[PDB]
Write a protein that binds this ligand. Structure first.
Ligand SMILES: CC(=O)N[C@@H]1[C@@H](O[C@@H]2O[C@H](CO)[C@H](O)[C@H](O)[C@H]2O)[C@H](O)[C@@H](CO)O[C@H]1O
Ligand SMILES: CC(=O)N[C@@H]1[C@@H](O[C@@H]2O[C@H](CO)[C@H](O)[C@H](O)[C@H]2O)[C@H](O)[C@@H](CO)O[C@H]1O
Lengths: 309, 309
């Protein structure tokens, strides 16, 4: 029986699985009114990807395809007809919520669209177009292979093979950034399907543990932080995918250890469906040294009583 | 002895180690007049990182730090005083060519700077600043902790903590994109230090094998492709770092296999210093199916004669 293991990576060596930026801290908080059902960064401990999860951070919130002129519309001057990583048209009949890597938060995603290369004399960054991809637009239908592009800088050309590089999120007067409200992958008034399940603590006194990053915000949230919290960093997802070690129990007891002091700082429950719970009450950014990392201890059932963190 | 292994990943499941985009193809070519001495994606087979190589794709050609006003006189309206992943000031005395993740190509890197969040009414993408980072500028001195920022869109504010997200490259009338000319990390008229060694084929009939991507080009190279070629994908670098398996000979013989036909398509020599050679003459994008991957076969010496590819 292949042993289950975790990669040995400090917090600064981990990538957010919901946006291509490094993890900054571990963070716990109650679920109060949030449905915790993110679709990127979903993977069982025995290596089964779930939701819209794939292996490349460079594909998370990244899009590519052909631009289609959309005249008669205030917001999206063009659409993007999405293609697979190598030009193949996306099949909406796959049993997934949306193309793998699709943004799994509600609101505005900001990035740069690039298109056919232009001559040097055309101008500086003339093939770079700042665009908003808003999930509240009626044109946000990634499940059927089309999203709406709202150009901000540098008019976008139709009928050109284009790539979208994500930079951050945005919040304008009527579109709040809501990381735990899934977007309508199939368009307005349509409900989401084939979703990775929502997660929540089920043992008394426990809370979810998140890998937390601050995403750049190009509009709004003055004096505030745009947080993106994932259940698993990308490197854990990829490690479980590679190893495919069979799960021997409901929970993998993991201990957070400091390697040069040799002491365990706290412990947590890594559930077989791919998320972590800790014994704590309240919103709390975890105070841990920069060289610490989780270590797989043993297989326990879901009724294991953690030491309070 | 811990066995040496490669990760089981297809071409579309690999990331360029020199720019945060996926690998598109394998590509071999003679060195003719290029010095092949890239500094990102450099790692020995037993897990020794070299050059400017670190583990995160989100750190390659990404920068962060404090903006500094620069009036007088050239290209760069502001400088970026570089800081570590968590705000620590960069130490120029470290035995490395430049901060880890620093671009290792000559020319113009394009991306978006983000700064202190602004209110919603400030405007769309107002906290998004399109900038050129040119290595031919006298302000390109990342080895001493500072680079020059040429603003294209959205004036950059001084004295703000800022993050630069890379998007692509650019080529203007006098700054060609040269992926095999290392930039002057320490400024104009200064030579580079602490470099990972240059690589070249040393056996008759052999050429380097590259992992190739097309990087977005926001100015110039009309009708052309801005290729970035790396010696190792990021996933191999991180795998070797995790495993740290001892190298038993000068060369790891590796075979490219198709897993659903069972056939071996070609073989190659993976040298212990972390680069691949193949038996081929001429520039050639390798014609291989999308499901193929490299498999470690055996340890051989540097004089192993490969089957012609
Ligand atoms: C900031 C604001 O309130 N803008 C209003 C527009 O709202 C945008 O609508 C598009 C869809 O067309 C997206 O949903 C985007 O996220 C929204 O911010 C609205 O379309 C127009 C209607 O006249 O009014 C603007 O004020
Ligand atoms: C396109 C062009 O010819 N530009 C010239 C400027 O060259 C730039 O110089 C900066 C450093 O100052 C960078 O090296 C950049 O990559 C260059 O393109 C040059 O500075 C000015 C002199 O006035 O002339 C421009 O024509």
């Amino acid at each position: 029986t292949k042993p289950f293991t975790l990669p040995i990576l400090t917090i600064s060596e981990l990538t957010n699985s919901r946006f291509p930026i490094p993890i900054e801290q571990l963070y716990t908080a109650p679920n109060e009114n949030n449905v915790v059902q993110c679709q990127n960064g979903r993977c069982t401990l025995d290596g089964e990807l779930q939701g819209t999860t794939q292996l490349l951070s460079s594909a998370v919130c990244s899009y590519r395809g052909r631009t289609v002129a959309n005249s008669g519309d205030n917001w999206d001057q063009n659409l993007l007809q999405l293609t697979y990583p190598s030009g193949a048209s996306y099949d909406p009949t796959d049993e997934v919520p949306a193309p793998l890597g699709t943004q799994d938060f509600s609101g505005i995603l900001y990035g740069v669209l690039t298109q056919d290369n232009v001559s040097e004399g055309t101008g500086e960054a003339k093939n770079a177009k700042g665009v908003y991809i808003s999930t509240t637009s009626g044109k946000f239908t990634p499940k059927i292979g089309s999203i709406g592009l709202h150009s901000i800088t540098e008019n976008v050309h139709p009928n050109q093979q284009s790539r979208f590089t994500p930079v951050g999120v945005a919040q304008n007067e009527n579109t709040p950034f809501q990381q735990w409200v899934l977007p309508h992958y199939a368009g307005a008034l349509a409900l989401n399907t084939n979703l990775a399940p929502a997660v929540a603590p089920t043992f008394p006194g426990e809370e979810l543990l998140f890998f937390r990053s601050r995403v750049p915000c190009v509009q709004g949230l003055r004096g505030q932080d745009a947080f993106i919290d994932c259940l698993l960093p990308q490197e854990w997802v990829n490690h479980f995918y590679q190893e495919a070690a069979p799960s021997q129990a409901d929970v993998a007891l993991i201990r957070y250890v400091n390697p040069d002091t040799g002491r365990t700082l706290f412990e947590a429950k890594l559930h077989r469906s791919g998320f972590i719970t800790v014994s704590h009450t309240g919103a709390y950014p975890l105070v841990v040294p920069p060289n610490g990392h989780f270590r797989f201890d043993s297989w326990v059932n879901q009724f294991y009583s953690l030491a309070p963190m």
